[PDB]
Subunit: 132 residues, 3 copies
């Protein structure tokens, strides 16, 4: 019965570093547990969730982390070969309680080549696997 | 109780563009909601589904889209560095109703380097997350 | 009611080939269905499971397979462009019965550039989609 899911896309490239990436294009976010203006997902239903993210790389390297309450729980890295775009993904099962927050963020200003556009979709998704 | 899931693999490289990619190798498709001869997934049970795809890149760039009823809902892109294969993935939560169709397709003839073989598996998967 | 999920990370790079990759860093493994010392996941609850893996490539090419009871069911490949790291992912729906085993393994010694570290996470995840 309990349901929570979302898939958001970034319409513009090179988000600011050291802060939640504000994916603004909504593909699905019916329960509104993800906030487009903050780029943060807030848990309302306790349980284990599955998160997945896909980023495109261009201009420079990309180092991105999946954060939980301000702490990085997973890092994904990919290097840019001059003149060629690349794509990198990551995913993880995370146990969440009410008010817990999850988001994506670029920790370092040097590896910030996160690319996205109307035709190249870097995205972020998540959904409740089992209520607990 | 309601169940719907599938994982299919492409046995040959470079599928035709502008049409559903016919993944022919079945890993799982018990409910038969995915059609190997059309490469189209048809919803029989309303609800939110999670789709995931993984493609290998070789020969030229790859631009692939996840389509819903003839309209692209997500694009994944990756460029081919001469002499080196690459791998790109994408995924999304999609709300579906009975008779809705979902598939993967290469929109452009110029970015059609979708590679696959008996030992390098480009795949397509999907499963019901929550009945509605 | 039935629940089974896990997400593990490899703390060191270049695991031994021809044997299960022993992901040692636990992100989630409450049901303990995955064994860190063997790198093998053993099914205790029959049903269809979804597995996902993400590897980073460095030094040489990477050819990795998702195995079920000693047989490869899916292969992912990615080539290393000298001086540039790459990232490759794969996923699949697998029907499992009690005592069935699933794991990741590098079949060939020539394509063993599987990289991982404290800041670059190659991971392996899986969870029960539907009990059967
Ligand atoms: C012709 C139409 C606009 C009207 C435009 C809109 C989006 C464009 C594509 C994407 O940008 C991805 C990729 C970027 C590469 O650089 C070159 C190849 C490719 C497939 C582009 C091709 C072509 O240019 C497109 C389809
Ligand atoms: C020796 C046996 C056939 C008997 C053949 C069957 C499939 C072959 C592999 C895959 O093709 C992927 C990859 C392609 C690269 O190009 C070179 C490396 C690698 C790992 C290949 C190596 C070797 O050649 C294989 C194992
Ligand atoms: C300054 C701190 C240690 C104190 C160290 C700890 C982990 C390091 C990063 C990762 O290694 C990934 C990546 C490898 C590239 O090679 C260079 C860029 C980047 C983002 C590294 C940058 C920097 O060096 C880091 C943050
Ligand atoms: Ca590339
Ligand atoms: Ca590559
Ligand atoms: Ca790269
Ligand atoms: Ca590359
Ligand atoms: Na990649």
């Amino acid at each position: 019965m309990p349901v929570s899911a979302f898939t958001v896309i970034l319409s513009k490239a090179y988000p600011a570093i050291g802060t939640p990436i504000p994916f603004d294009k909504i593909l699905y976010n019916r329960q509104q547990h993800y906030d487009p203006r903050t780029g943060i997902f807030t848990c309302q239903i306790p349980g284990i969730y599955y998160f997945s993210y896909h980023v495109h790389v261009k201009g420079t390297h990309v180092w991105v982390g999946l954060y939980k309450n301000g702490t990085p729980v997973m890092y994904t890295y990919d290097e840019y070969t001059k003149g060629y775009l690349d794509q990198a993904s990551g995913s993880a099962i995370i146990d969440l309680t009410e008010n817990d927050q999850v988001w994506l963020q670029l920790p370092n200003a040097e590896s910030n080549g996160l690319y996205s556009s109307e035709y190249v979709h870097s995205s972020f998704s998540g959904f409740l696997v089992a209520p607990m």
